[PDB]
């Protein structure tokens, strides 16, 4: 998860807020320090290897300072709703191959020229009601998607009974028609997947898809048999991994930039972000100017991250202390 920096970006984790530097005992403790006036701002950050302190911010040269509510970083899993097109026919027509084409973008590569396609097949029979078609279609998708010898997990198939309308029922390549017993299956849902993630190696990413349909011959003409709707999602990624990869990257601006390259001959760096939690982020921008001829600026970013208990309590405590010690008015969350 390499990012772009305005001449630098630094990160410090706030696992606990203290009043003085004589109280920085634990390896996440932080405290904002500033003059009795308002001339410089810096933070005393307790590292796993002793106290440290951020760069010194000239408060005449603070450009912007703003926090985030920890929900602007969650990625909602793109959810779809497949259905028979009533216009063509509200039921399958016997003797027709109701194929479905799942077009995938951002497959192994990172561009969209990198595409991948996965199909489903359902040959309709006489008396094949709609629920049975969705059942057999979902199963064909699962089977063709998750063959035990298929590396990447691409999508999660689901089904919804018109009775519930909310509780989506899963469909795996291990699922059997015997397990799907209802008869009022209204539609087929398809959803994204949290691809595998590795700290510093494999960034948080997703494979976008769109269900594309194939033509069938209804009364005399070739027509698409379904409808691919983009319904509102219900599942998110909790932002834990973005911050972890952010710290991993932003602690090389403050230390070992090799992070394992010459393996036996490396430095071991500790990280205080728990990937599995959810964080609210504070970010400060500023710059440094020199004297007579050295007027050029050097803009900088000092970044903080706290833990979101759902009420933005810790990040609010930070902002309170920073504004009390700096005269700033960073808006609370």
């Amino acid at each position: 998860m390499v990012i772009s920096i305005n001449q630098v970006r630094q990160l410090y984790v706030a696992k606990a807020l203290k009043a003085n530097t004589a109280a920085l005992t634990t390896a996440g403790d932080i405290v904002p320090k500033a003059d009795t006036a308002k001339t410089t701002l810096y933070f005393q950050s307790m590292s796993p290897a002793g106290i440290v302190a951020s760069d010194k911010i000239n408060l005449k040269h603070v450009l912007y300072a703003k926090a985030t509510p920890s929900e602007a970083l969650a990625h909602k899993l793109v959810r779809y709703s497949v259905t028979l097109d009533a216009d063509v026919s509200a039921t399958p027509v016997a003797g027709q191959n109701y194929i479905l084409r799942l077009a995938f973008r951002q497959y192994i590569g990172l561009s969209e020229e990198d595409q991948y396609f996965k199909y489903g097949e359902v040959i309709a029979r006489s008396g094949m009601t709609a629920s049975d078609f969705y059942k057999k279609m979902a199963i064909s998708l699962a089977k063709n998607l998750e063959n035990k010898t298929e590396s990447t997990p691409l999508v999660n198939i689901y089904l919804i009974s018109a009775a519930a309308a909310s509780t989506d029922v899963p469909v795996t390549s291990a699922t059997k028609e015997s397990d799907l017993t209802a008869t009022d299956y209204n539609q087929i849902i398809i959803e994204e997947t949290e691809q595998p993630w590795v700290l510093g190696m494999m960034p948080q990413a997703f494979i976008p898809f769109t269900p594309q349909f194939l033509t069938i011959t209804v009364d005399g003409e070739d027509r698409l048999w379904g409808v691919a709707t983009v319904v509102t999602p219900t599942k998110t990624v909790p932002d834990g991994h973005l911050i972890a990869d952010l710290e991993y990257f932003c602690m090389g601006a403050r230390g070992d930039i090799y992070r394992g390259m010459g393996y036996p001959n490396i430095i071991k760096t500790t990280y205080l972000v728990d990937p599995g939690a959810v964080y609210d982020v504070l970010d400060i921008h500023y710059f440094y100017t020199g004297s007579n001829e050295s007027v050029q600026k050097s803009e900088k970013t000092i970044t903080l991250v706290a833990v979101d208990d759902g009420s933005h309590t810790a990040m609010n405590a930070l902002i309170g202390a920073i504004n009390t010690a700096s005269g700033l008015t960073i808006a609370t969350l």
Partner: protein
Amino acid sequence: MKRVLNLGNLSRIVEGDPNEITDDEILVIKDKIIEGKIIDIQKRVDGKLVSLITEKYT
């Protein structure tokens, strides 16, 4: 036993929209619920699209 119509009049047995069926062509309406069965054979007479199968009751 012999063929029912010259292939010229059989090549005009089509499968489509009832609104686009003129004369010099016969229409077949395939059945959906049933695979091979047919619903009706139709032939236009005076703008109306009438059936050639005689209605049969109990």
